[PDB]
Amino acid sequence: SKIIFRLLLNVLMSIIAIISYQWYEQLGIHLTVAPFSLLGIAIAIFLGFRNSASYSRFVEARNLWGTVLIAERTLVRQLRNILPAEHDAHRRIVSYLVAFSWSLKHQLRKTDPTADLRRLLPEERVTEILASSMPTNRILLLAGNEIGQLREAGKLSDATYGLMDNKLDELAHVLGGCERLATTPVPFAYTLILQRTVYLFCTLLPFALVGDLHYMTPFVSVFISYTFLSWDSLAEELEDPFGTAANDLPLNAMCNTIERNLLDMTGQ
Amino acid sequence: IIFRLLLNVLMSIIAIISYQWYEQLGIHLTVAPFSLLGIAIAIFLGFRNSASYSRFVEARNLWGTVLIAERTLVRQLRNILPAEHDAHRRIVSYLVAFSWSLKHQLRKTDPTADLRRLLPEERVTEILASSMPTNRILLLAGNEIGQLREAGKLSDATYGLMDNKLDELAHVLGGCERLATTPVPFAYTLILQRTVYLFCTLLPFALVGDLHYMTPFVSVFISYTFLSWDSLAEELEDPFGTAANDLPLNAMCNTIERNLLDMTGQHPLP
Amino acid sequence: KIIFRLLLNVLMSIIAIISYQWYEQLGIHLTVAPFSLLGIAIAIFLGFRNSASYSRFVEARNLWGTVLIAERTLVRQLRNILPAEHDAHRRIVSYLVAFSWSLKHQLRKTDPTADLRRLLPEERVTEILASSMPTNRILLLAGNEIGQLREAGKLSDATYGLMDNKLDELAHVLGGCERLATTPVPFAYTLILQRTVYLFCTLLPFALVGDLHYMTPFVSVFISYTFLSWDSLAEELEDPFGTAANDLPLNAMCNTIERNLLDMTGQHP
Amino acid sequence: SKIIFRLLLNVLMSIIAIISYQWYEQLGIHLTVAPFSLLGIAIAIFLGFRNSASYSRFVEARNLWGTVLIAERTLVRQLRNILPAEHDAHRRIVSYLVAFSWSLKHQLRKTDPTADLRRLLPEERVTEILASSMPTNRILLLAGNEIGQLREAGKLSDATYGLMDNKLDELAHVLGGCERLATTPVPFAYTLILQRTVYLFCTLLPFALVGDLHYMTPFVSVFISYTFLSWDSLAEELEDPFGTAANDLPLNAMCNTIERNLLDMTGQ
Amino acid sequence: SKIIFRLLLNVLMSIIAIISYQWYEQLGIHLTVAPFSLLGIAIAIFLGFRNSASYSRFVEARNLWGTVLIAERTLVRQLRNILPAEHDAHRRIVSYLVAFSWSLKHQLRKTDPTADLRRLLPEERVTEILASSMPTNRILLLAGNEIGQLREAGKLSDATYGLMDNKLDELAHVLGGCERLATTPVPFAYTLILQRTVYLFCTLLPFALVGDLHYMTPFVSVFISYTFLSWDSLAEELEDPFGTAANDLPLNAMCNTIERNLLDMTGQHP
Ligand SMILES: [Zn+2]
Ligand SMILES: [Zn+2]
Ligand SMILES: [Zn+2]
Ligand SMILES: [Zn+2]
Ligand SMILES: [Zn+2]
Ligand SMILES: [Zn+2]
Ligand SMILES: [Zn+2]
Ligand SMILES: [Zn+2]
Ligand SMILES: [Zn+2]
Ligand SMILES: [Zn+2]
Ligand SMILES: [Zn+2]
Ligand SMILES: [Zn+2]
Ligand SMILES: [Zn+2]
Ligand SMILES: [Zn+2]
Ligand SMILES: [Zn+2]
């Protein structure tokens, strides 16, 4: 992993420590364990809480995408149970809903939505969408129109119109939810100080351990350092949920899963 | 888990009869650093277990909602269309199918017997055809509700009162799928799992200094405490897991099936 | 009976003191630092555990709080929307009061027939007792009152819906309570903590006595009180529908609910 | 506060402990610092969690009062956007809504609503309200009547009556909330368990510290005692958020804001 | 960061400890680590919790502002969807909504709204608003009259009027949510209780540290003093998240984003 260099720099710090041990008392430098326990504990506490934030936030990102799936399932269902005749409205609204998903993925990944949109929508609509500075939000507007048309067509009463509007309000909360997550990281200060104090602590560690361990310092100073670094490096792997790294959310697969659902619900 | 306590008891007896040669080559092991280690590990097991618990509780609430929504939906059908018992039985079928289908979905088991029992094989082929069978069942339930509305028997206002219930089931389906395919840390629950193991096997080697012949007893006390708390996290982290406790999920589906037959007068026997 | 094993710990100290003489002559040594470790780990786990229990107790308290709110405002909607319909008003209210007591009985695993017969006609009592879930049944009946008022033109779909929502909220309380009860916190959870906290407490003197000697029991009792006070509080909060000291005054809560609902419909004790 | 008494009571336990450490070996009492680390840390952890539960109880209280201002604000707003003419239902309802706030404050403060209530209401109902064992609930039932009246007087549709009924529901939940936080205190075993243990731990502490610290004992021990006592004290200035205090909710200030706010939205 | 001052000051104190260590038993002052190791872990635990409380406040504040964006977006959507033609109502309502954000941030930052207020509204209104002792709430009420007017003009039905109405309720909740976090901070028993205690501990720490560290008591004490002091002040920063510190909320960006959004392309739509 990205973790295995500091682990080794640690072994080499154990070794710089073993064969440097006697010029110690000469200088007057002595290093006991006790204050490094007070430190190491206070750091474990702060590590603990921080990781908690990181995990909460990765979970919130998962919830949010989970909701896209639930609302578009519902909204499609409602269209099938209320207007089971109109399949043109069906196919239209479904393509916007699928478009919203891909569009939001692209948005969070800062990639180009254009191919996906052109695959699902008429070119005139793609033009409308990409013209907006907020293309994903503009897709809700369009979906909202199809709904709105059916309403004044008289196919939908204000009641049933409202049932479907509420699902658009949910997609609206996913969109803001995601935008917020993507511009509001766990504050920088956390991951900075923890990263400094944890790294310092791990490299200073075999120095204040050698007096007690002698030769069995590497296999213990490593084991202690693996532990703190495995924990601090779990926050890292949980703080970019919209990424493309292995342990980020599989938004591509999720978008494919969403599209496959709404198509199962409409015969295609 | 009872296996690596013996391994611990052995690793102790190894460290006893062996911590004669340790003095040779100057290799030492205090208790202070294994106390910094262990308290940090304990702090992290704390937070980890806290996350795991939270996933367990969320799964309970979700299933909790199935019971609530289905009871309310069926109550709504009785209070609003007290006469329409053919619709009452069709919808209660789907709702009961929904729950079992869900359970089977999360446990990765075959739902066919349960579906075949509850619904006409036309609809069972249809549902089994789909790759989202539980979702398909909601859609069918929606149709029954929908048809009562075209038929003129439900107003848009009172159709809505029921449609809310199906949204509530929709949210449960999604929530559960998110928990089932959502091991938040991909195989880093594996790194932390082994970190506790190394610590519980290296520990008697570190403790033997101050305890001697008492080492296997105080080393296995401590190991059991850590291994227990850790196994508990694994059990909670995965409430629908490849080896969970089915009892409550089965209990929940039987409760809701019983509940609904009661509400629609199928019970007690005439 | 927590003073029960506070007492036993004192003797274990004595057993540790009395026998400290001949276990220099037994090849046994027991230091504090390992028990500091173990003891802190357990403290940390007790800390999180206890936290989860309080959360369950607050939820239960809160669900019950919602019975009172929902039922109050269902009655308020009955009065504001149908001021003339006092027959409905009292039937419904007798169901909602029946709902509350039945819920207490359900949670307490006790017979609701007394309280039921008191509040409702026996034909209804039988209908309700015939059911796998009498509280469910009672919501269904309250539902028909509301719903018959609708067939009869006296409630619109809109205002029927307003009241249906309240029945819906009660359903949620019912399921919530049902869940907090049929979900005793995971099996391999409490069993590990009692032994660990017990075993640790009764072994602590054997380790404390090298440092403390005759002081062992005073210190060892203090430490064990602390851990046990904490561990036992978790238990009594864990089952909030029981009859323990901080176990919700469910009878009192039920009375408050009945006095409230009677005060809204013009009646007196 | 009352704290400083047992700060000094601790300084005196320190001196007693110093000038009786000589009779220790004589009496047979050894007191090492290490078991009081295990203890003190455990007590800290339990103190940490407890304090945490009290904070959240206080926050729930603030949110509940937050909801009163919000609900009453938008109920009045809804009245002005739906029935902008009918200023005499406006004034009746705004006075009922203000009565509610005050009646709630008084109910929680376990004091007397009669003065504040007569200032706001015609006493043909002020006696009705005070003749109920649940005055504040009765004030909602009456606010409900005004809305109920406007509905059956055709000035409100079901739709619009609904929109406003939902705001009464919201106040009902605040009432329940507050009452619940009043009658169900934080489980009482928490408090006494904790400061039997905290106070007993701080008085017993110098007798174990003196072996190591000698004359430095009162300084260090008063510090440690300050810390714990402080934290434990903070938890109880938060456990009773409706109470008689300066670290409690400025309930009077909050009702004054609410009353000005509702008068301000109607032009008085 | 007023930390470097206190960090170096600690280095002073940490030298004083090194020069006066062998004169300890001459003055009668022994000072071990365990009492400070105890004291310090307790302060860690409390710092950990309090910082957790602070982040909660930050996170909620961030959430409340996220909702301004969401709710305003969908209210405009609802108006473009239900009354697609009514663009002069659209324009009026959007200005009130953009006014609402700016007005709120000024309210929370304790600054003057009038610049931003006139930038957006007719002057006859910029004083109806500035006149109320609660302006953000007055701006809402104004946005409400617009929706209400469309409703009496029969352009909106009670149903669709309600859809829009709810979105203004959602905004009333952000308003109160934000006042709650402003007016009520966390108890200022966070000098006497936390800020001063962490420091008194940090300066005394080397005096109890030297005997062990000898010639390392400025370093290890400044490492420890860093860690503790970082977390106390980060905590203090995050609790006032409408503040202007480096880790507070970007209220100004957020209001731009809201503004750019509702005026998405000079207010034009499909
Ligand atoms: Zn939904
Ligand atoms: Zn179709
Ligand atoms: Zn990434
Ligand atoms: Zn529901
Ligand atoms: Zn039937
Ligand atoms: Zn049955
Ligand atoms: Zn309610
Ligand atoms: Zn009546
Ligand atoms: Zn509201
Ligand atoms: Zn007026
Ligand atoms: Zn008049
Ligand atoms: Zn009086
Ligand atoms: Zn919304
Ligand atoms: Zn327009
Ligand atoms: Zn020196």
Author numbering:
A (entry chain A), D (entry chain D): 22 to 289
B (entry chain E): 24 to 293
C (entry chain C): 23 to 291
E (entry chain B): 22 to 291
Excerpt from the paper describing this PDB structure:
Compared to WT KpBest, the I180A mutant displays a much bigger opening at the aperture (radius 0.9 vs. 3.2 Å) without altering the overall structure of the channel (RMSD = 0.4 Å). Notably, the structure of this region is well preserved among species, providing a molecular basis for dehydrated Cl− and CH3SO3− (radius 1.8 and 2.6 Å, respectively) to pass through the aperture of hBest1 I205A in the absence of Ca2+. While mutants with conformational changes at the aperture (e.g., KpBest I180A, I180T) or neck (e.g., cBest1 3A) do not have structural alteration at the other restriction, a mutation near the aperture (D203A and D179A in hBest1 and KpBest, respectively) impacts both gates, suggesting both independent and cooperative regulations of the two channel gates. The hBest1 4A mutant is designed to be deficient in gating at both the neck and aperture, because the cBest1 3A and KpBest I180A mutant exhibit an unconstrained neck and aperture for Cl−, respectively.
Human bestrophin1 (hBest1) is a Ca2+-activated Cl− channel essential for Cl− transport in retinal pigment epithelium (RPE). Although the structure of hBest1 is still unsolved, two Best1 homolog structures, one from bacteria Klebsiella pneumoniae (KpBest) and the other from chicken (cBest1), have been previously reported. Overall, the channel is a pentameric assembly with a single ion-conducting pathway, which varies in diameter along its length and is constrained at two narrow points: a “neck” contributed by three residues (I62/I66/F70 in KpBest and I76/F80/F84 in hBest1/cBest1) on a transmembrane helix, and an “aperture” formed by a single residue (I180 in KpBest1, I205 in hBest1, and V205 in cBest1) on a cytosolic helix.
